[PDB]
C-alpha cells in the first residue's frame, strides 16, 4: 500500500506556523484541564496513538489517513481519554479547515512537545484523509502489563530499534495515568519536557504493588509510578545501558527523541523528491507571543 504526501493546496511554512500558534495559544488558555496539567501531555499521546497503529509489513494504519476521526478507532479501548485531545483540536480545525486530519493530529503532538520546552521536532505536511474502510482494527497499540521482550518485539512492527524505543518512552515524563482510562493509578504529574523519566527509573525506590483495578504497577515512596513496560527498561541489560545514557545526557536524549518522534509520525508516508523540506516551527516564546 503506497501513501504519497500531497501538500494542502497553496500552503507553505507560514500557513502551518499559524496553525502551530493557534494550538500553542489554546494550550496556554485552557490551562485548568486535568488538575492544571493542561492539554500538552494528552496531545503528545494522541499523536503517538494515531501513528502507532502502523504495520511495516503491509503499510496499514499510520498517521497518513487521519482515521482516528472514525468511530472504530476513536472508540478503541487503547485510546480511552484521547477524546479530550480530539475535543481540544476541534476549534483549531474549524478555524483552519484546509488542514488534513492526520497533519492536524501529528502537528498537535509536535506543538505540545515544543511548547512544554522539549526539543524541536521537524515536521512535514501532506497527510491525506482516507475513507472509513481504511481505519485499522483495534488491538495494534501496546499492552502495559508486559515485559522487555514484549516491548522489543512490539516495536519491531513500527521499525523501531532499542535506542528508538528507550528514547520514545521518555515521553512518560509527561502527564499521568488515570484509573478510569487505562486501569493504572496515576502518580505525580508534569507538563515540562525533561529527561526525568530515566532519572526516576534509576534513582527512586520502587515497590511492585497491585492497584484498585487489580493491575500490577511499580510505586515509589515519593509518589511516582511506572508501568511494568516502563520498568522493563531497567530489567533488560541492553535497555538499561541506554536508560543510563539518557539519565546522564539531556541534550543526547533531546536529539534522539526528536529523530524517533519525527520518524514515528512519518512512518508509512512516501515523500516525493520535490516535497518541501521539513518545517521547524518557532515557539510562541521565540516569536515574543
Ligand atoms: C510500550 C509502550 C507504551 C505503553 C504500554 C504505554 C501505556 C500508557 C498508559 C497505560 C498510559 C496512561 C493512560 C491514561 O490512563 O490516561 C499512558 C500515558 C501516556 N503515554 Fe504511553 N505507553 C507507551 C508508549 C508511549 C510512547 C512511545 C509515547 C510518546 C512518544 C507515549 C506518551 C504518553 C503520554 C504523553 C501519556 C500521558 C497522557 C496524559 O497525561 O493524558 N506513550 N501510556
Ligand atoms: C510522571 N508522569 C507520568 N508517568 C507515567 C507512566 C506511564 C504513563 C504515563 C505517565 N506519566
Author numbering: 4 to 292
Task: Give me lines lifted from the publication on this model.
Another type of cavity, the W191G mutant of Cytochrome c Peroxidase (CcP) is dominated by ion-pair interactions with Asp235. We turned to a mutant of the CcP W191G cavity where the substitution Pro190→Gly has been made and residues Gly192 and Ala193 have been deleted (P190G/W191G/Δ192-3). These residues do not themselves directly interact with ligands but form a capping loop that seals off the original W191G cavity; their deletion opens this cavity to solvent. The closed (W191G) and opened Gateless (P190G/W191G/Δ192-3) cavities in Cytochrome c Peroxidase conserve most features that dominate ligand recognition – the opening of the cavity only deletes residues that are distal to the recognition features of the site, and the crucial cation-recognizing Asp235 is conserved in both (Asp233 in Gateless).
In the docking pose, the ligand contacted Gly178 and Met228 via the benzimidazole nitrogens. In the crystal structure, 22 rotated away from Met228 to interact with Leu177 and Gly178 via one benzimidazole nitrogen and the methylamine tail. The second benzimidazole nitrogen hydrogen-bonded with two ordered waters; these water molecules were not modeled in the docking. Compound 22 interacts with two ordered waters that were not modeled in the docking and the ligand is rotated as compared to the dock pose. Third, structures where we observed a substantial discrepancy between the predicted and experimental ligand poses saw the intervention of new ordered water molecules that we had not anticipated in the docking model. Part of the effects of opening the cavity to bulk solvent appears to be qualitatively captured by a continuum-based electrostatic model in docking, though the role of ordered waters is not, and their effects can be considerable.
